[model samples]
Target chain A: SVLSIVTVPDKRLSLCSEEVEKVDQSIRKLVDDMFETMHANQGLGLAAVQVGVHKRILVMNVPEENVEDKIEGYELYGGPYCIINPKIVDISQEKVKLKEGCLSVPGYFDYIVRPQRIAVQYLDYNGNECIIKAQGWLARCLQHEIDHLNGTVFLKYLSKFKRDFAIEKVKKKERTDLI
Target chain B: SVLSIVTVPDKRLSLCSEEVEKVDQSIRKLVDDMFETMHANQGLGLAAVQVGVHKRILVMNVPEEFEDDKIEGYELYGGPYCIINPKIVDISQEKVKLKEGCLSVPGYFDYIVRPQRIAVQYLDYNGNECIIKAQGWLARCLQHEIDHLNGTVFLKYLSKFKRDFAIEKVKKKERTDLI
Candidate 1:
């Protein structure tokens, strides 16, 4: 059951998501829907909040073969993992720049500087506690989805001029598509 | 002497423009440059703040032939007007909806509801105090530019969904244009 994605300035997208009290059937259902929605949209990650659910839940899948520059000790291939109440416990001082796009902010992409590696703690879909150290694009993906839980968007990282330029581009596309 | 118009997310656009202490040579020169910038951008009205000048000044030119619906008792034909320290003293309770666009938020246009008529007091380019009763597009244009002086954008008048949609459209256009 794919869900509708809430876009920017929708007020909902700016809201802080609440932590899931328990990873029960309902929470599991939401995670499933998020994965389905993300795959449908061809997105690497989807936060529950983006689907209009204000829960600190997110799901992601980074294709194994797509890892052009893999960081040692950080595996990039795995299941479409469902993370609940995700929190970053540690991150590297070093940073990397990566071009990113969002399902909510469709048709727009820009380079965002983020930590090169991060250790995050969260509850898996089965309600089991888990912590993973991630690097490369996987680390960036986690950081991006985590920002969603905090009511922040990738656009916030851009300079005023670049952000405005991106928005103007979105506006032009809307008009052209409508015509 | 066209000035550069600042785009969205710039801190200056969110700042309240200070009233001109006296409309002197500098203010006059600023007004001249504003007109040039507005003309170059093919905009009907421009606020000084849009050009990074935090002054309560705006310049406008509504072509006579473009006055499709003229309100009575208000002449729509005149020289390009330079209004300084503009204030709306009175307004009609009845409102009208007009599609609006801003130079500061280029490539975006949305319907904005505003007063159909207004009585405004302001200093002209020559520093003479004047009052004008305006209606139709002129009234809307005045209201739009005046909002800029107050650190407001026409986007504020839109629903969260519509505003987000507009921003998304702008972002899309930026990506496509770059490609």
Candidate 2:
């Protein structure tokens, strides 16, 4: 099925998502649709909460090149997993930070510090229970999407000073007035 | 007071953070924001980096709520707070484990072992330097995210059994029959 590419400022994106009672076919459809949309948008991650749907679902793929060696969108290994109401349960004593981008906010990127390693508890696409440890970019993406479930966007940390500069840049793009 | 939810993986949200030369109550915005995001996302606490912008900012609110409370959003302090770039400069002899969650990775939660309590240090939103003798969930959150600054995202603690569960789930979800 073809999926639609979603953009921001979509009211449905912030429905204050209700928790998933169960991972039935319906939730799975939404999750699959999200992956379709993510690939369509040339993005590595997509959250169910971003497409005007307030569900705690997320789908992700590895960086394009990582999969390049494998040669198939259908198979992103050690990668491309769907998370249903996932959260971090334990973090390593060490941490690692990486600059990340999001499909929901196109043409923008920032450094998001995350646990270098983590222990997470989540449900698989079929609604089975699972726990996993993550490191590198995978862990980063997991933490990032989970942040959205709580209604918090990563931009709030932009450091007012940096944000001020960015605000001006965006304002310039939007054809605004501050003269 | 109210809290600002820190959504994960979005850089735009963090534009408000700035490197605080000093940590103190003056950086009230971080505290205020942390509370705003935390409450909106229904999180116990939040941090600057989680929002994607960097500046050693983190805020927290008590799990309990107060009605007609004397505190305004920033003024209304029902344990609502913003701590700047908190550092575990020192730790106590105690360590313990507890359940925890982040504003990011919504819908999922977990249990982790951490310092039962801590003698933590951080600058307030106003940039005033301060130290906290915090324990329980608050201490855990602080250590968890501070670890993030060094690049962390909480899944590293999975037992060997837990790791296998994760791998199994990752394999199971990759099926083309998904959705």
Candidate 3:
């Protein structure tokens, strides 16, 4: 079942999510719904907070072929990852700026600067401990979703002026659509 | 001389402005340059912080013809207003949401909710104590510039998700324009 995604200005999205003590059947069920929701919205990743759940959980499905600037010899196939209590254990000093859009903040996309590579620790769908090193778009996806868990939106990385400008555009679009 | 308006990511904008010790010739000179900068940028209002000055000062020129939903019996003809150490002494319970764009946050505009009427107290360009009752666009403009004195931008009123979405769009526009 695809859960509804909460959009911007909803106070729930501002909440810092709570960690899952144990990945049980209910959590698994949520992960399934999150994947469905993500797919339904055509989103590359979805965080639990976006679905109105304050849980440190996220889902991602970055196609291997779609990875930009793909690093040679790095495996990128297995995905539709269900991450629980995700933590960035390490990150590269190198940075990459990429265009990003969110399902919750619909119809707006922008560039965000993030670490090019990251080592993340989390629990898998089966409650198994997992650590993965990701680079390129995959790393960016993880960082984006993780920020959601921390009650942060990618816009926070921008200067206040630019962020506000983007918001004005969104508002104009919304009003224009209403007419 | 027109002053340069500081854009986002500038730490000075985030700093709470210091109250003007005296509205002297220097303050008057800054006000003149502020008006020049504001007019050059085609902005209706501007704050000292926006011009990289951490003094509690703002200038506005909401043309009488531009007042939206103008209230009856309210006279609205005034040249540009230079305000120092401004304070909102009273505000009406009635609210209006209008599209607001800022000079510091260029090329973006969004609807912001603000009081329809406000009674503000401040020092005029001549260092004389003055109080003004403003409504409609003038009120909104005052609220916006005063927010700058407190290290707040109009965008700060938006939710984090929406704010981030806006930032992303700005980044994308900047990148696209670069090419």
Task: In model 3, state the lDDT of residue A44.
Answer: 92
Tell me what TM-score chain A of model 2 achieves. 0.76
> A-chain TM-score per prediction?
0.90, 0.76, 0.88
DockQ of 3: 0.01
Global Cα lDDT for candidate 1: 0.80
For every model in order, the fraction of real contacts preserved is: 0.00, 0.00, 0.00
Off by over 4 Å in 3: A1-179, B66-77, B174-179
Candidate 3: the clashing residue pairs are: A110-B168, A155-B164, A168-B109
Residue B51 shift from truth in candidate 1, angstroms: 42
Please give the ranking of all candidate structures by lDDT, highest first, separated by commas: 1, 3, 2
Q: Which stretches of candidate 2 lie over 4 Å from their true place?
A: A1-16, A63-77, A164-179, B1-179
Q: Residues B24-111, candidate 2, lDDT per residue (tens digit)?
A: 4545654565566667766666666665555556666665434372212112123565666554534544678776665544433567
Q: What's the count of clashing pairs in each model shown?
A: 15, 78, 3
Candidate 1 C-alpha lDDT tens digits along B48-89: 989998888998888766434555567454459999978555
Ranked by lDDT, the better of candidates 2 and 3 is 3
**Model 3 lDDT tens row, A1-179:** 98877876576776657658689999999999999888888889999999999888999989852535566644344488999978555566567778999887777788888767777789999999998788877888888998888667777768888667666665665575643
